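Design request, tokens follow.
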């Protein structure tokens, strides 16, 4: 399959990237170096992951080594919830740029629609436990994102974990200057996201699927939770194709015209996950995988469920 998808800013985005949430800081430099050496050209990052400096060491070394050129890389990061303030967006972006050793990002996302009170804590809480919101809305934050394009800090802007009425709000913004290029959302066979994906694709927004393997390293994993990688129905499709279950789980979103960002810090798996360009799932395979939907989320931002902009009370 073609390796890149055209975005609505005119740039091409690699359809397979390396995820970095939970990648330990003492392992992620090597993970990203290995990834670039074996062909990855897209790294998904975020300030909240607390490892952008170490990701940046890898990127910089591979640029210095002339393994790749900067124009060939597609580096994504995200604006954390405590920086939804007109006066904080540029500095948040610049801190990410400084940590990643870059002078621009290919794509910068609003990480969640919910703004939180600024300060040192990523999840500022009241004495009773609930997230303390910001009064800044998704439209003013969007305007601040647009300024980053106009200042040359980022080539594209987008959103993450926006439901379709939140995407619609962005699209309907008075005076909208740049449409979102991407909506990055959780997507896998147990949370297949057909409604949100069709909405976004109909609007020309590219969808990136996160947690495509079901995030087995998520910190809140419970033994009785479903497991994609161990689902024997998925294993059977993999066996039929002489591929791993992970490889099927990665190819699946690719054939839905999605970008996909599996995370690994294991060198052998980083390579395995890239070897997804030499087989095709049939339409029957695709529909069968879609049939496994159970509306199951890895990421439900459960502390934030009263925030007025919490995304997952809406059907989609
Ligand atoms: N925008 C948002 O709100 C969010 C964005 N994301 C992004 O999406 C990325 C991917 O999602 P994430 O939640 O990390 O989880 P994934 O679904 O990518 O699963 C990662 C886990 O799968 C393991 N794994 C990777 N490859 C294989 C393989 N071939 N065989 C077996 N196990 C494998 C990893 O192990 P190991 O590393 O030990 O090899 C790790 O435990 C994140 O890292 C982040 O970049 C994720 C959640 C939210
Ligand atoms: O967010 C991530 O990329 C991956 O996950 C995280 C990554 C981090 F580095 C820190 C927290 C999270 C959590 S707990 N994320 C879930 C989450 C956060 C905020 C809101 Br609004 C809802 C929600 F569901
Ligand atoms: Cl972030």
């Amino acid at each position: 399959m073609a390796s890149r998808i055209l975005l609505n800013n005119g740039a091409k985005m690699p359809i397979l990237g390396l995820g970095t949430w939970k990648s330990p800081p003492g392992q992620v430099t090597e993970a990203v170096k290995v990834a670039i050496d074996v062909g990855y050209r897209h790294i998904d990052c975020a300030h909240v992951y607390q490892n952008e400096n170490e990701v940046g060491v890898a990127i910089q070394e591979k640029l210095r080594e002339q393994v790749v050129k900067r124009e060939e890389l597609f580096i994504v990061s995200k604006l954390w919830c405590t920086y939804h303030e007109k006066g904080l967006v540029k500095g948040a972006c610049q801190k990410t740029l400084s940590d990643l050793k870059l002078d621009y990002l290919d794509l910068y996302l609003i990480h969640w629609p919910t703004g939180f009170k600024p300060g040192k804590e990523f999840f500022p809480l009241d004495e009773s436990g609930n997230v303390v919101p910001s009064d800044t809305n998704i439209l003013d934050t969007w305007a601040a994102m647009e300024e980053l394009v106009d200042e040359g800090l980022v080539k594209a802007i987008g959103i993450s974990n926006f439901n379709h009425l939140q995407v619609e709000m962005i699209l309907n913004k008075p005076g909208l200057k740049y449409k979102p290029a991407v909506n990055q959302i959780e997507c896998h066979p147990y949370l297949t996201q057909e409604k949100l994906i069709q909405y976004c694709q109909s609007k020309g927004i590219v969808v990136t699927a996160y947690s495509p393997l079901g995030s087995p390293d998520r910190p809140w994993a419970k033994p009785e939770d479903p497991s994609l990688l161990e689902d024997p129905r998925i294993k059977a499709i993999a066996a039929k194709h002489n591929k791993t279950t992970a490889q099927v789980l990665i190819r699946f979103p690719m054939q839905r015209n999605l970008v996909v960002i599996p995370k690994s810090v294991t060198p052998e798996r980083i390579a395995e996950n890239f070897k997804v360009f030499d087989f095709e799932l049939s339409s029957q395979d695709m529909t069968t995988l879609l049939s496994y939907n159970r509306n199951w989320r890895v990421c439900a931002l459960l502390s934030c469920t009263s925030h007025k902009d919490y995304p997952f009370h809406e059907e989609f």
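Comment from the thread starter after seeing the answer: thanks! Residues 19-22, 44, 111, 160-161, 184, 210-217, 229, 244, 246, 261-266, 269, 272-273, 298-299 surround NDP (ligand 1) (CB under 6 Å).
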